[PDB]
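Reminder: ligand-aware prediction takes two inputs, not one.
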Amino acid sequence: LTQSVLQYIRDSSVRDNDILRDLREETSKLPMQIPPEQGQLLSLLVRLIGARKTLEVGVFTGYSTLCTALALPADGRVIACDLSEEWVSIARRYWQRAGVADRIEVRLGDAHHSLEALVGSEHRGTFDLAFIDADKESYDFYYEHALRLVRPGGLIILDNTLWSGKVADPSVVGDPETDSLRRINAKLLTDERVDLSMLPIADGLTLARKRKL
Ligand SMILES: [Cl-]
Ligand SMILES: [Mg+2]
Ligand SMILES: [Mg+2]
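Here is what comes back for the chain with chloride ion:
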């Protein structure tokens, strides 16, 4: 049973707290259930690379942002390109509760517009890490912009790259989101600009380290 093993990973390794628990419950009741193991991995990766400045695309109720910001130093910053207006007050409340609201710079609005502004700014090539969880049709655009935005040696992370297994399912034909993911996953395999690892965790997580050239 894969369900019993997934339950065991959560029971035996997730370091939860009432802030994270409440945010997952509140998000579940809105009109995907948050996988806590993924936020915890993101926090570990931030610490492992000694990240100080990170980029996020998606944000939603701010769970990944909260995990990321808690792993940063006090002077650390997250530029959070938020695609959900409806939920900013939720995200803000949990960031304030955790004492990290001052580390998070919210950029609400179209992701393409935000990333174009960032590439055309002093922020280009300064990010230690970028985390992308957004509309799958746009992943190639987000990846290409993250590659310009992160420093050499920086880490790009694309979430949900396994898309409920649809990428592997031969019966899924004519679906724009699945086709876009199949294209970007295939492109990353042979992209000499990065080191790659695709993880099965929480609906797939692709790690791409920008090579120094
Ligand atoms: Cl390298
Ligand atoms: Mg996100
Ligand atoms: Mg995932």
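The chain has one domain: 1-213. The first strand starts at residue 53 and ends at 58. We will return to this case in the review session.
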